[PDB]
Design a protein around this ligand. Sequence first.
Ligand SMILES: C[C@@]12O[C@]34C[C@@]13C[C@@]1(C=CC(=O)[C@@](C)(CCC(=O)Nc3c(O)ccc(C(=O)O)c3O)[C@H]14)[C@H]2O
Ligand SMILES: C[C@@]12O[C@]34C[C@@]13C[C@@]1(C=CC(=O)[C@@](C)(CCC(=O)Nc3c(O)ccc(C(=O)O)c3O)[C@H]14)[C@H]2O
Lengths: 411, 411
Amino acid sequence: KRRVVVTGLGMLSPVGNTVESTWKALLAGQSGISLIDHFDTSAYATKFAGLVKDFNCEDIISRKEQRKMDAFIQYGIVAGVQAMQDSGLEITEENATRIGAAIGSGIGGLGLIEENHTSLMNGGPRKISPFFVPSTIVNMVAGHLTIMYGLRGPSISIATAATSGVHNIGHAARIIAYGDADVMVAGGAEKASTPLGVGGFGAARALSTRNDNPQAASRPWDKERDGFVLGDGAGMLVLEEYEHAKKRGAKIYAELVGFGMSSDAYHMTSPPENGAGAALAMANALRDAGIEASQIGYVNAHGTSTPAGDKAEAQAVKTIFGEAASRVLVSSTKSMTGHLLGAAGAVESIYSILALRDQAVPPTINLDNPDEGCDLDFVPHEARQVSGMEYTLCNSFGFGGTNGSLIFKKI
Amino acid sequence: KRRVVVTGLGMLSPVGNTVESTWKALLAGQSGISLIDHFDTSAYATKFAGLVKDFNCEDIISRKEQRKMDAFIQYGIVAGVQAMQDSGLEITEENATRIGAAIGSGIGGLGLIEENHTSLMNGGPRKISPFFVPSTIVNMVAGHLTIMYGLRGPSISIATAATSGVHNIGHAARIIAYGDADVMVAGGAEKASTPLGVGGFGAARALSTRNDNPQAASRPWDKERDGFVLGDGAGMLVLEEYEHAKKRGAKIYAELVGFGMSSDAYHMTSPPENGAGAALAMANALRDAGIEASQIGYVNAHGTSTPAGDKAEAQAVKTIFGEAASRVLVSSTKSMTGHLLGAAGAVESIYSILALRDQAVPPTINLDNPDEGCDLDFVPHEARQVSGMEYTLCNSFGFGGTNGSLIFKKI
Ligand SMILES: C[C@@]12O[C@]34C[C@@]13C[C@@]1(C=CC(=O)[C@@](C)(CCC(=O)Nc3c(O)ccc(C(=O)O)c3O)[C@H]14)[C@H]2O
Ligand SMILES: C[C@@]12O[C@]34C[C@@]13C[C@@]1(C=CC(=O)[C@@](C)(CCC(=O)Nc3c(O)ccc(C(=O)O)c3O)[C@H]14)[C@H]2O
C-alpha cells in the first residue's frame, strides 16, 4: 500500500513570488488586489485583479524560450522549478522514467490567443505565430518542465476550470499510489487577467465591480459580496511515494491521505442551493482517507465571493460536519489573493499544508457582516492559532459542476 | 481486483455520424477529407480537412442550449448521448453517485473564441457573450453530459493535445478500478477546423498542403507525406466495472486491460528520432496488462502523416515488438479520417475495440511508397482479415511530448 507525501513546494501569487513570502502575507491578512494597468480598462465593468508583481524568470527561462510561451506557462515553469529545487530531488537515468507531472490550467494562454487572433484579423493567417498552439494550450507547462528536467514518467494535464489544481494534485497522487510513478510535480497555473478573461467573466456577471475599493471587493460570506476577483499565479507541489522520500532523506511537509470527486449535475455556472455536490466531494475525500469529519481542523474553502456559490459551500460544510460544524475552522484565502482559477486549488493545497506545519490558519478578510442564519467559524479578519491539528481539507469547485476535495495529514 | 469493460460506444467522424457507419467506411478504405467551405481559405496554405458532414443535434440538444456551446461541445454531447443510449444503462438515485465522466479536448472552443474576440475587437468588452467561458472551455462536454444524465460521480477532463482521448479513457478506467465509480462515460471531442486552427497548425508547418488532392494528403509512412490533416469529431465509450456490467446484463464490447503513459522530454512539437517515449508508453501498457508484445495482434498507431513523427513511432514499434515486429499489424486510420486531435485517441480506441469484435483491421490508405529500411506491416491500402486476435493496442501522442497507450482484450 503506497503512501504519498509532499516534498517540495513552489508558488507565484498576488501576495508573494515565493512560497514563504506568500504564506507570510496571508497569515498577516494582506490583500494582493490592485487596479489593472497593462490594458485600458475604461470600458470594463471590473478594473482590478490579483496580479503577480514584478514576475522575474531571467535566470530560469532562456530568452529564446520565453518568446514561445504565454505568461501562464512562464508562471507555471517558475513555480515548478521552485518546487523541484525545494525538493532536492536529483534526476538520474535510473530515475527519469519514474518521475512525471500532472499540471493544468482552467483557461490557458489567453494573452497569446488574443495576440494571435488580433494578428489574423489585421493581416491574415500569414501573421499567426508558428508558436500559436504550443504557446497557448493547457498541457504546455507539463511539457516544458518535463523537457527541462528530463522527466520521462507519466505526464497529464487536467483542465476542469477552478477544480484543476485539486484534480491535478489528486490524480498525481493516484498515479504514484497505483505504482506508475514514484514522484510527480503537480499543480496549476493561470494568467487570465486579460481583455477576454476580465471581459468574459464580466459578461457572465460573475465578477465583483467594486472598483472604488479593490482590496475590499473579495469578501466571501459577507452580505455585500458581488462576485469573484480574478487572480493570477501558479502553485506546484512535488508529491513522492513515502519510502522513496525517506530513503533519500527528503524533507517531508505533509502526507496526502484523501482525494474526493463529484459532479453537481445541476447548472453550468452555479451550484445547487443544497451544496449536495460539494458535500459528496468532501465525504468521498473523508472516506478515502479513512477518517471522520470531526478530525478535520481546517477547511480551505472554494469560497469565491459570489452570492450563490458561498452559500452552497456553507450548506455543504454544515451537512458534512454536523454537530462539529462550528468547531471546524473554515477560511477563504481568495479574500486576499483573488480566484486563481486553474491554479486556485494548487496554491490553496499549499496553504492547507503550511497550516499543518505552522499550526496557524489564515483569515477570511473583509467578512464585516456575514450572511445570517449560519453558525460556521469562517475565521473572519484575523489569523488563528490552532492546537493539535492533524488534518486539513482543501475544496476546489468548477464551472460544469465539477468538484474536488483533498485531505492532508500532518507528518 | 476490479476489471473494466466497455459497454457503450458513441461517435461522430469525418466518415460517419454513428459508430457503425464510421467503422463500415474505415474498413472500406473511404477518405473523409474534403475542401473547406465554411470560411474563405484563399489566404490559407491548407484548404481542406476531415469535416463532420450534416451534423444533426435537433432531437438531442435543445435550441436554448445549443446557442450556449461551441461546436466541439455539441459534437461531444451527441457522441456521449449515443454511447449512453447504446449502453442501456438506467440512471437512478441509487446509481447517480457512482457514474461519472472523463472527457476532454486538445484545443476546445476555437470557433467561439474567435467569435467573441472578433466582437471585442469590433465593439469592446460589452459585446462579449455572457457564455464566452462556459461555451469554450475544455471541461464543458463533461459538464453538460453530467447535467443531462444526472451523473453525480467523479468528473474530470484531461487536455493533453492529441493524447487527450487516450488519457481520458485510461484515467476513467483507473477511477473505476480504484473504486471511485462503477461507470464512466469517457472520450474526447474537437472542432479545430477554424481560421485559428488551420492557420495555427499551418503556421507551425505541421499540416499537409496537398490542396490539389485532399484525399491523398494524409499518407502515414509514405515518402511523399508532408504533414497532418486536421479532422473534427468526437468519440465516447461507456466504461464499466465488470461485475456491475454482468449483473445488469450489459452488452460487453471488450475489456480495457492496460494503460501506459510517458513523456519524451525532448522537444515541444517533435518526438526524438529514437521514439523512446512512444516505446516506454507501450511497454508500460503491456506491463499494466501483464502481457508480452507478441500477444498484440494490431496497433492503431498515432501515425499522423508527418515526416518525423511517423518515423519515431515505427522505430518505437520495432523496439517493443523485436522479432515479432513484422508479425504485428500496424495501421493509421488518420489516413482516412485526418487527425481528430483531442478526440483522436477516443475514436481510435473505438476502432481498436471493433477490430477485436470483427477480427478485421482497417488499412493505412495512400501508402504508395513507404519509407525505406522498415519491415513493419502497415496494412497498406486494403483492410485485413485477422484470425485469433485477442488484444489490440491504441497509441496517441501529443505536443509537449506526452504519450499514452491503451490495450483492449477480446471478451
Ligand atoms: C447564471 C449565474 O451563474 C453566474 C453567472 C450567473 C448570474 C449568477 C447568479 C448568482 C451567482 O452567485 C453566480 C454569480 C455565480 C455562481 C457561482 O458561484 N458559480 C460557480 C460555480 O458553480 C463553480 C465554480 C465557480 C468559480 O468561480 O470557480 C463559480 O463561480 C452567477 C447566476 O444566475
Ligand atoms: C519544429 C518542428 O515541429 C514541427 C513544426 C516543425 C517543423 C517540423 C519538422 C518535421 C516534422 O515532422 C514536424 C512536422 C512534426 C513532428 C511531429 O510529428 N510532432 C508531433 C508530436 O511530437 C506529437 C504529436 C503530434 C500530433 O500531431 O499529435 C505531432 O505532430 C515539425 C519540426 O522542425
